[PDB]
Design a protein around this nucleic acid. Structure first.
Ligand SMILES: Nc1ncnc2c1ncn2[C@@H]1O[C@H](COP(=O)(O)OP(=O)(O)O)[C@@H](O)[C@H]1O
Ligand SMILES: Nc1ncnc2c1ncn2[C@@H]1O[C@H](COP(=O)(O)OP(=O)(O)O)[C@@H](O)[C@H]1O
Ligand SMILES: Nc1ncnc2c1ncn2[C@@H]1O[C@H](COP(=O)(O)OP(=O)(O)O)[C@@H](O)[C@H]1O
Ligand code: BEF
Ligand code: BEF
Ligand code: BEF
Ligand SMILES: [Mg+2]
Ligand SMILES: [Mg+2]
Ligand SMILES: [Mg+2]
Lengths: 164, 100, 50, 417, 417, 210
RNA sequence: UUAAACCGGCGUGUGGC
């Protein structure tokens, strides 16, 4: 259960590209995408798994907007009387508690989101490797040209773009 | 990889999983009308040559891969019925499920 | 009883309805708006069946 | 209504009040659980309850209104505070908040505070526009807090001796260095009683950490003011909780320009708890204390200060020696240099049934000229000059005899003539 | 009938009674298994059995009536208690319950208690409407419990010395700090015998944790009262079980306004078991003890208190030193500050065949003026004044010689004249 | 503008200046946090801020401009210094740098120093071509730094006694060996005051630890 | 380059008309 998730976050190789905080926010996103599959109601669900202390506890986001379609995520600009919300924007609820726990498709979603997150961390790494020269002349070969922008390479998988 | 009968079926409604037990085989006495899953035979398809991160990840998350393969038997379109007897036979060495 | 009167009842009368909290309101929002209907729609012909 | 209004009275009145409310057998559950059930029924009667408590902020952003009589600990009557109040007013830890509360609907946890009506015994407008505590300008003790009672009791000397050894004032940082079985309990008792009787203007906040429950009951119903304590019944977690909570309450009360006396005993057990609840840095110091184990204790100790704008925070934390091991002594050392007020008690004289045995030699106060008038300072200088060249036993018997032969301190000056 | 009524007698009478009941060979199974089979047959005769035991509550909500002679442990005669009784009366842990029981039908486990007839030797109406234990008001020892026997035995001195070193009373919290091979066994033996003979009004509850079975047999059939013990035959689980069970029984008996003496030896092995059964917090303290490993021991130790309303709980838990390692000493330290009653025994004098070797110097009692009259207190003060300036061996030989030269303690006062 | 220019004054002027800038309630956050928000708004007005601070170099190669009034510690107004400046001028630790700074875009951390305008109260050309400190030639105290004030105060003696006990000069290495409760505080106080009054040419840098 | 939508071959045996 939660001890398994703790073992996973202890066993992640890129603890430096993705420390505990990014790991449990990635699991937030993973459980959200999993709840997208648990219920046919497409609802954004933060779950604040509280990595260090304990395990997940499911919430429900109100997505404040005057519309009413998918009412699990519909609140008008001022519907904040009940539950002492008293907030126009950002007031979100905790209605459904302890939803479907980890199953195999939940692990599939977690796996894909954590691997794309490792990819995003490597993108931050190449950002750092291309930075420190912001505002300097640099050499670069191009890869593709488009009507709105062009792609450029420098070496070491250094990817950049030049807009129109 | 081998073939499994894990009842965790992806991309399927809960109404279709209602007849299934914890193992993946419907109980003895639950009637079926249309094409409804009664064997949870979902198995991986994803090829080898995955990066070390992929292998370590799928290992630390249990034993999960491109398992989305339905590969499940349903009733033929047109025939109803009520299951009254289940028969399962394992190969020597394969672990016996709880229903067997 | 009939939503023929609740169709003329928007979401401003949901949490003011007595004892509509977290899970009961969740069910009300789910089993009503997911079937193609919207909670609260203005019309003027429900009495004469027109 | 107010929880403390139901808490000042024993479980018997709570039981009969619940019988008035018509509920299940109340005596079976705990008395604070009785109060929870009683407030639930009172809310069922169709009225908004009025609650109060000091704020405790968790990581999630919401708050808990811990009550005074519950020793600032977790309870079923801890009012939930929605984050919206922290967004509007940003009430920090220790802010005494009073306002309207509602019952918990099912699947909820506790009562929820709807609207604040009183912020630290002041209007809520002063809560947002206010200068902070760590943002203040610390200073020395300007105003003197006299200690003698004035009617000449036997333990009244235990206050006079302080006024004769080293004065105590607002915003000071006091240490009480004493071994076990020395006389610290009765000392802080009469100190609190004298502060309350002679100076009822200041807010007396006596503190007790990891003592006998009988001691807690003797302290709560003997002195004037709020008595929050955490005995050995609570682990280091609740110890550090109550400690930081009372210190933040004192911070807020000084922010509201009020004087707070914090008599704590002992600081060594607090330091032990802190060293218990710190992450390991892969190394240990001399005595068995972690490296960063002193940072938060030092913060809690240095929270006391005298302010230019208004209010004061004066802490008197007792240090414990003669424990056999090093680590406690280490604490003592790390605490002699941070506090600007030392007071040392004698056990070698206490075993002789000679009370009170205060170390007149190593006692002292930094910037003590601001703690007493001119000619009284001259006379105290001459008196310490007289006390110095004689032996320890000599000075102590002279003290006890000639002060019990007197009634008040200025009478003592006029008798030494 | 009652299980203890079949338990006071050996296995021989149980065997012949089972032969009277006409069953399979009884001597083959265990004697408590014999009692189980015998009660099963007695229930087969068409009668409702009358059972009794103290309640143990599991997570499921039902209860077990553990018997006294079974050392408050799991047995085949542990009466099952349906949750409906916990819904009606809410009998907590340690409540001595007696009532009607039925045999277990097949596929069941044990006997089921139908209707309670006696709750803690009182009517069941007092069980629901009653003030709780942790809800009481703790106080100090007001009434003095004398220890001397009165006929002048050689080990009678071992009681007198206590009355001469530091008095003992109701609601006190006593520690016995002694190394191995010092004389704790015979000491607590004659202490229990003197409490029983001179003060038969109070409930003597001697406790034994992790000792020799021969010691358990010597303790059970020598002193007055119930003797529950758990030797090394049981792991830390059953150790903490019997400990919490006797402490909850004492809590309930004090709730019923009765005095309970709990002589425990030793507290260090109990602390070791507790440290064995706590979850790891990813860190260790000095000596090899977990952080939260002391919370529950501290609770069990501070359960003792003197009550305003009625009853008292006085525990005398023996502390063990000179074990070579640190952790045990650590326990001792964490236990000197919580107990308000210390008593220290000497092994350096015990090796000299000088018994009893009680440390007269570091022994003491807090608020000991409430433990003895006025002039006797003056005389004890003067006697300690006389004992102080002489050496350790001097004080101890003076003690033993001049007290064996006396018979009683007031006779000792009148001989010192 | 300059952070210290907003730091010499208490939190009250900072609060009214933020009210002039039209922001959220400033008194709620800390006064140095007030300065951070105020400089953020000042940068929002479309102007390049002028900052200054002494350089602190981490392992990554970039730098932080710690301010004087913040006790040379970590703060929200610590100007980020890109490694390119350490590549051009190679400003070492302790170099008082003043120059143009920009606001932090979102997802960034603090203000970034664009171009240095003042290096240790001198032109930046002297920063690259300069002889180093551990590269110097150490010597003894040649010039004498007198300590007596000259108007005869009671603690003026506390300076005179030094001039009568053992003189003090430039480049010296002095120790003050004293037990607690001896009079070190007032001593160093009047020492600093006498050095400042009688010798205002030298840079007085008083230090206090714990 | 980006966005949206959709994604029985063979033999054998038996029986019937
Ligand atoms: N001012 C005093 N007058 C008389 N006795 C005192 C006084 N102070 C302490 N005592 C004695 O000290 C004992 C309690 O000491 P205690 O406060 O427990 O010291 P510590 O806090 O160092 O353990 C009491 O028995 C009491 O007789
Ligand atoms: N009052 C006493 N009179 C005579 N001998 C004693 C007395 N108390 C203890 N002893 C000696 O102590 C020994 C038993 O010590 P024991 O109680 O087992 O040590 P511990 O204090 O470690 O439990 C016996 O052999 C006995 O001779
Ligand atoms: N020249 C002086 N005139 C008057 N009082 C002095 C003088 N020097 C020291 N003192 C007194 O001695 C104390 C010294 O305090 P402090 O400077 O903190 O000593 P230390 O630096 O050793 O801690 C002050 O409280 C002050 O009252
Ligand atoms: F025995 Be003292 F209270 F440390
Ligand atoms: F060996 Be003894 F019982 F401490
Ligand atoms: F010597 Be003091 F602590 F400044
Ligand atoms: Mg004490
Ligand atoms: Mg023994
Ligand atoms: Mg100093």
């Amino acid at each position: 259960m939660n001890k398994e998730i703790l073992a996973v976050v202890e066993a992640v190789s890129n603890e430096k590209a993705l420390p505990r905080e990014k790991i449990f926010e990635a699991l937030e996103s993973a459980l959200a995408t999993a709840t997208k599959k648990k219920y046919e109601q497409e609802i954004d669900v933060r779950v604040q798994i509280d990595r260090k202390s304990g395990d997940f506890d499911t919430f429900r986001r109100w997505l404040v907007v005057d519309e009413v379609t998918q009412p699990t995520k519909e609140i008008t600009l001022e519907a904040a009387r009940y539950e002492d919300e008293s907030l126009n924007l950002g007031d979100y609820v905790e209605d459904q508690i302890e939803s479907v726990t980890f199953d195999r498709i939940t692990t599939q979603t977690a796996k894909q989101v954590i691997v794309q997150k490792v990819r995003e961390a490597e993108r931050a790494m190449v950002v750092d490797q291309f930075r420190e020269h912001e505002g300097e002349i640099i050499t670069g070969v191009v890869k593709k040209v488009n009507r709105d922008n062009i792609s450029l390479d420098l070496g070491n998988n250094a990817e950049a773009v030049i807009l129109r | 990889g081998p073939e499994e009968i894990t009842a965790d079926i992806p991309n399927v409604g809960e109404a279709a999983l209602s007849k299934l037990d914890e193992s993946g085989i419907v109980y003895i006495g639950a009637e079926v009308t249309g094409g409804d899953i009664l064997v949870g035979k979902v198995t991986p398809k994803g090829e080898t040559q995955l990066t070390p991160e992929e292998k370590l990840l799928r290992a630390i998350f249990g034993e999960k891969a491109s398992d989305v393969k339905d590969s499940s038997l349903r009733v033929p379109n047109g025939v109803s019925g009520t299951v009254i007897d289940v028969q399962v036979f394992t190969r020597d060495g394969v672990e016996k499920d709880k229903r067997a | 009883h009939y939503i023929g009167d609740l169709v003329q009842r928007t979401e401003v009368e949901l949490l003011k309805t007595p004892n509509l909290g977290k899970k009961s309101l969740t069910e009300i929002k789910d089993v009503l708006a997911s079937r193609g209907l919207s909670l609260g729609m203005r019309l003027e012909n429900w009495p004469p069946a027109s | 209504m107010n929880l403390t209004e139901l808490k000042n009275t024993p479980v018997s009145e709570l039981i009969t009040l619940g019988e008035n409310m018509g509920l299940e057998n109340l005596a079976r559950m705990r008395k604070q659980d009785i109060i929870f059930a009683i407030l639930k029924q009172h809310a069922k009667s169709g009225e908004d309850i009025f609650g109060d408590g000091v704020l405790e902020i968790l990581q999630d952003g919401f708050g808990f209104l811990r009550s005074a009589d519950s020793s600032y600990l977790a309870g079923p009557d801890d009012i939930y505070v929605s984050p919206s109040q922290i967004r509007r007013f940003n009430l920090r830890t220790g802010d005494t908040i009073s306002g309207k509360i509602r019952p918990p609907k099912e699947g909820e946890r506790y009562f929820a505070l709807l609207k604040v009506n009183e912020v630290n015994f002041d209007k809520p407008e002063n809560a947002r526009n206010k200068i902070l505590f760590e943002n203040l300008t610390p200073l020395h003790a300007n105003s003197r807090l006299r200690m003698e009672r004035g009617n000449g009791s036997t333990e009244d000397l235990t206050a006079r001796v302080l006024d004769l050894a080293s004065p105590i004032g607002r915003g000071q940082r006091g240490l009480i260095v004493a071994p076990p079985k020395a006389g610290k309990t009765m000392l802080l008792q009469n100190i609190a009683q004298s502060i309350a009787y002679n100076h009822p203007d200041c807010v007396l906040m006596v503190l007790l950490i990891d003592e006998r429950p009988e001691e807690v009951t003797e302290m709560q119903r003997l002195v004037k003011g709020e008595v929050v304590a955490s005995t050995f019944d609570e682990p280091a977690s609740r110890h550090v909780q109550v400690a930081e909570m009372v210190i933040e309450k004192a911070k807020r009360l000084v922010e509201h320009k009020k004087d707070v006396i914090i008599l704590l005993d002992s600081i060594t057990r607090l330091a032990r708890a802190y060293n218990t609840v710190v992450p390991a840095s892969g190394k240990v110091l001399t005595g068995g204390v972690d490296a960063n184990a002193l940072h938060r204790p030092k913060r809690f100790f240095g929270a006391a200060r005298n302010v230019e704008e208004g209010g004061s925070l004066t802490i008197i934390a007792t240090a414990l020696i003669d424990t056999g091991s090093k680590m406690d002594e280490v604490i003592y050392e790390e605490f002699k240099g941070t506090g600007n007020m030392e007071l040392h008690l004698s056990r070698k004289i206490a075993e002789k049934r000679v009370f009170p045995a205060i170390d007149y030699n190593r006692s002292g106060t930094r910037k003590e000229e601001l703690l007493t008038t001119q000619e009284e300072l001259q006379k105290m200088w001459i008196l310490r000059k007289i006390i110095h060249p004689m032996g320890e036993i000599d000075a102590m018997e002279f003290l006890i005899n000639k002060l019990a032969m007197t009634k008040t301190n200025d009478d003592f000056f006029e008798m030494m003539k």
